[PDB]
Design a protein around this ligand. Sequence first.
Ligand SMILES: CC(=O)N[C@H]1[C@H]([C@H](O)[C@H](O)CO)O[C@@](OC[C@H]2O[C@@H](O[C@H]3[C@H](O)[C@@H](O)[C@H](O)O[C@@H]3CO)[C@H](O)[C@@H](O)[C@H]2O)(C(=O)O)C[C@@H]1O
Length: 130
Amino acid sequence: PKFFYIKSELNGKVLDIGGQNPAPGSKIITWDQKKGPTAVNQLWYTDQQGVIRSKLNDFAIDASHEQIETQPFDPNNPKRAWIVSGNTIAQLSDRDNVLGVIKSDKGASAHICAWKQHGGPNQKFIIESE
Ligand SMILES: CC(=O)N[C@H]1[C@H]([C@H](O)[C@H](O)CO)O[C@@](OC[C@H]2O[C@@H](O[C@H]3[C@H](O)[C@@H](O)[C@H](O)O[C@@H]3CO)[C@H](O)[C@@H](O)[C@H]2O)(C(=O)O)C[C@@H]1O
């Protein structure tokens, strides 16, 4: 219902499920903000507890692998509980661990990782209502 974009303060692009792939394990990148029907893979919402889910498949953000990917939500997996805290997307169980944008080294789209808060814009995001 209440959807929003998560925009990076590093490049101005938004969290986006690469190629709108609905399958679990799909990498989340930053891509030009889209508007209209096709923007679904860039739209997110928070469940009751405040955990971020994707409008595309209701999957959560997961940081179990090298780069963040979408995965079905699991209340027992600390790596799948991410919330909006100020201008940071922080881990529910560790506010010091936050998402950050890392530009591609091979001309690809930027990807996202989770690591200790270091105050730069790469770890800052703006929540934009749909
Ligand atoms: C190898 C490759 O295909 N690289 C492209 C990359 C991949 O397709 C995705 O990472 C697969 O998950 O997508 C890039 O663009 C991202 C945007 O894709 C848009 O959809 C594309 C789709 O990805 C293309 O494969 C398809 O041919 O056209 C679709 C529509 O243009 C999404 O709509 C958009 O939100 C982004 O996710 C990328 O940079 O990752 C382009 C790579 O060349």
